[PDB]
């Protein structure tokens, strides 16, 4: 057959690992969609059916964009009385939830609980990365690379070094928003300062939830900064420079990694 | 005949194994069908007999050689030639039984085992589970000779099954899972011998069902979760394509896309 595709009921996690939430669980038309700490209960307002017809539904109503301009908010609304083009979203494999008529993406321009969701111009930013799951906590992996060495954080600095099975400094949290976080300061994010070659990648505050803080583990084993289209690179195949950078893709072993859990 | 990809354990390096597993992958599927960033093996329906299999020739620094046939539609070993004698796993099905006769044409004579090449049967003939059969360039070397001498009558049955369990994971399962390829690569890196951890067992147990869940997935999210294991025994579920993209490299074709 053609692949049936099903209608999974699922949470949607995003910025700083919080959930897509109908505010206060009031399903009146026009009420806002917010970021809220992911619950562990049955409450329908963080549970979303991904319908065959490209609608995302909670309790019966449709996730709906208030409009088609950047910055306008997203509401729960009756699926039949709403504008059909405002109820349709594509969930992408690189983590972005886009509204086709608008070409704008479900966004969380702030990281605090209660933040109102918006649609913004897509810049593959951490504020715009989502994932549908009932798995509330992030994926904690070591990240093995060149010469079988491990990605390691030490305060702001990050480099690869010999893999020690203890070392918490080598544990990483892959967040639903596409950020890669040091296990010991989940407030902080694997970060590129610039969209240019040989940008040295650091650990900084996730505060900005920026394009340079979003990553995707790809099928060829690279790790891609979506906005820049560059990938993680052990600079010059030299661990001892203690510098992981951004570099156009060529696929040699200094750009291949693997999430070993 | 069919494409043949060559590997050797003599001076086998991290390069030599890495380039081997790619070559096998690039010969299993054309890379034409890809679902949510993961390549799909060919569909058996519509695939002609002449492009049904590929062969991998394995040799030692004892210079023994042995040719294994993989079924391109599932990347799994169906049998092996060794000099002038071929041996085949018990085909689960008659149309498989006919595709089988199209391989190793010239062999002095064929043999078909009574048992299939699936882990459950294969472990009980070896008398030990995957959890306890070490893998690495060493074990593969031993396994290559054990397959060669079965023709001679020097390899006892539990050792032949044990040798099969080694080759299937370090060839087929590694070709399916970059994850598993990396676990083998780690062993070649430090020249260690090591039975697979629970994470590796589980992926290979889950391959068929992961192939189904990704291909029937709506937009990446699964209808039902799939349970996996960390390198400790501890458990955790996957609901979505996204973490699998770096972990699975080939899928068995299960349906057509829209």
């Amino acid at each position, epitope marked *: 057959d053609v692949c049936m595709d099903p209608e999974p009921i699922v949470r949607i996690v995003g910025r700083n690992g919080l959930c897509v939430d109908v505010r206060d669980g009031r399903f009146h038309n026009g009420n806002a969609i917010q970021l809220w700490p992911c619950k562990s209960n049955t409450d329908a307002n963080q549970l979303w059916t991904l319908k065959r017809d490209n609608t995302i539904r909670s309790n019966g109503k449709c996730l709906t964009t208030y409009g088609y301009s950047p910055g306008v908010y997203v509401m729960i609304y009756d699926c039949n009385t709403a504008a059909t083009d405002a109820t349709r979203w594509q969930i992408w494999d690189n983590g972005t939830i886009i509204n086709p008529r608008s070409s704008l993406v479900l966004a969380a321009t702030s990281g605090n609980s209660g933040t109102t969701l918006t649609v913004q111009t897509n810049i593959y930013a951490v504020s715009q990365g989502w994932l549908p799951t009932n798995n509330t906590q992030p994926f904690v992996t070591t990240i093995v690379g*060149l*010469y079988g*060495l491990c990605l390691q954080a030490n305060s702001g600095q990050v480099w690869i070094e010999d893999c020690s099975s203890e070392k918490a400094e080598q544990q990483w949290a892959l967040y639903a928003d596409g950020s890669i976080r040091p296990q010991q300061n989940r407030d902080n994010c694997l970060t590129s300062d610039s969209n240019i070659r*040989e940008t040295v990648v650091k650990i900084l505050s996730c505060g900005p939830a920026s394009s340079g803080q979003r990553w995707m583990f790809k099928n060829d084993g690279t790790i891609l900064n979506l906005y820049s289209g560059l990938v993680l690179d052990v*600079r*010059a*195949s*030299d*661990p001892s*420079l203690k510098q992981i*950078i951004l*570099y*156009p893709l*060529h696929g*040699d*072993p*200094n750009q291949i990694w693997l999430p070993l859990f | 005949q069919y494409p043949i990809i060559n590997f050797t354990t003599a001076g086998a*390096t*991290v*390069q030599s194994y*890495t380039n081997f597993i790619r070559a096998v992958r690039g010969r299993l599927t054309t890379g034409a069908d890809v679902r949510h960033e993961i390549p799909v093996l060919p569909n058996r329906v519509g695939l002609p007999i002449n492009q049904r299999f590929i062969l991998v020739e394995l040799s030692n620094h004892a210079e023994l050689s042995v040719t294994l046939a993989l079924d391109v539609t599932n990347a799994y070993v169906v049998g092996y030639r060794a000099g002038n004698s071929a041996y085949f796993f018990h085909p689960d099905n008659q149309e498989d039984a006919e595709a089988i006769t199209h391989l190793f044409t010239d062999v002095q004579n064929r043999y078909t085992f009574a048992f299939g090449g699936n882990y459950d049967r294969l472990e009980q003939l070896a008398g030990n589970l995957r959890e306890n059969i070490e893998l690495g360039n060493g074990p593969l070397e031993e396994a290559i000779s054990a397959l060669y001498y079965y023709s001679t009558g020097g390899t006892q049955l539990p050792t032949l099954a044990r040798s099969f369990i080694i080759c299937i994971q370090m060839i087929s399962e590694a070709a399916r899972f970059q994850y598993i390829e990396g676990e083998m690569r780690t062993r070649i890196r430090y020249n260690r011998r090591s039975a697979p951890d629970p994470s590796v067992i589980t992926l290979e147990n889950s391959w068929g069902r992961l192939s189904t869940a990704i291909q029937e997935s709506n937009q990446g999210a699964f209808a039902s979760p799939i349970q996996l294991q960390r390198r400790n025994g501890s458990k955790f579920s996957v609901y979505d394509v996204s973490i699998l993209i770096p972990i699975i490299a080939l899928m068995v074709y299960r349906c057509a896309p829209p």
Partner: nanobody, 115 residues
């Protein structure tokens, strides 16, 4: 096992130009071959190295001024250098390492560029 012989160390005033050469004795297939440099008292620093497949990593301070070519035929790397600053004054080491084994890394023993 592999050995690297260097050339081109010189004696220059600000604004000159210096080219450095390096020959090698084959190395594993995806590799890099380039130049490092160390002025006494300070630590060793990459200046430029090229990949097996023609891509190069270089240091910000030196880009534009410095050109790095290879030919791979039998293991050559060249470093071309203009707008010479008294800051480009160090011992320059030619380097070659592959990308599969950490061990397989090889150095010359430097040429003193004085500028």
């Amino acid at each position: 096992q592999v050995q690297l012989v260097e050339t081109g160390g010189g004696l220059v005033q600000p604004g000159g130009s210096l080219k450095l050469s390096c020959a090698a004795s084959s190395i594993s297939s995806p590799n890099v071959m380039g130049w490092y440099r160390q002025a006494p008292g300070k630590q060793r620093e990459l200046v430029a190295t090229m990949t097996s497949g023609g891509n190069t990593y270089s240091e910000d301070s030196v880009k534009g001024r410095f050109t790095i070519s290879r030919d791979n035929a039998k293991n050559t790397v060249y470093l071309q250098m203009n707008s010479l600053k008294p800051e480009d004054t160090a011992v320059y080491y030619c380097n070659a390492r592959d990308m599969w084994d950490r061990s397989h890394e090889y150095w010359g023993q430097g040429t003193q560029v004085t500028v």
